[PDB]
Amino acid sequence: SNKKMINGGTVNNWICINFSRQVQDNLARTFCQELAQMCYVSGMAFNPEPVLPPVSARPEQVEKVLKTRYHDATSKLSQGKEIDLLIVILPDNNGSLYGDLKRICETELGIVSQCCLTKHVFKMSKQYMANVALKINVKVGGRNTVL
Numbered sequence: 253s254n255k256k257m258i259n260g261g262t263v264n265n266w267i268c269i270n271f272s273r274q275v276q277d278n279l280a281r282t283f284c285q286e287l288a289q290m291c292y293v294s295g296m297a298f299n300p301e302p303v304l305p306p307v308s309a310r311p312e313q314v315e316k317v318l319k320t321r322y323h324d325a326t327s328k329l330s331q332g333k334e335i336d337l338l339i340v341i342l343p344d345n346n347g348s349l350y351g352d353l354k355r356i357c358e359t360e361l362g363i364v365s366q367c368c369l370t371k372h373v374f375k376m377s378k379q380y381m382a383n384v385a386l387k388i389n390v391k392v393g394g395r396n397t398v399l
């Protein structure tokens with residue numbers, strides 16, 4: 253028995269920001285679609301479409317891109333609704349980016365985030381997707397089985 257979802261959480265509103273120069277917009281798009289699909293079939297409610305298309309940014313502009321995209325996506329929502337998830341694509345070797353990302357999301361935006369390395373985005377294996385779905389589920393308030 254591999255882990256499974258007991259209670260699937262809900263992601264009605266999500267966006268993706270990409271920080272990897274090896275990843276074009278369409279690949280980010282396709283990756284997120286596969287991830288959304290896995291989350292759904294595993295037992296989550298998960299909108300197949302993001303609030304806004306993926307955007308690509310340089311790691312040096314992490315603060316600016318996050319706050320701007322957060323503001324723009326939120327303003328697009330029905331009044332009172334919030335962004336449930338930010339998917340972030342990172343270079344395999346990203347230095348301080350991961351930590352900066354987390355501090356901003358956790359303590360400034362108050363948004364749940366899931367980071368995904370470029371290497372995994374290119375591979376898009378079903379096992380990887382399943383694992384990330386499990387992580388996302390816990391983060392949005394769902395519950396998974398224990399081994």
Ligand SMILES: Nc1ccn([C@@H]2O[C@H](COP(=O)(O)O)[C@@H](O)[C@H]2O)c(=O)n1
Binds near residue numbers: 365
């Ligand atoms: N300081 C860190 C810690 C994790 N990561 C990476 O982020 C991923 C998981 O991100 P989450 O914390 O958002 O679940 C992994 O696949 C991992 O190797 C990183 O790139 N730098």
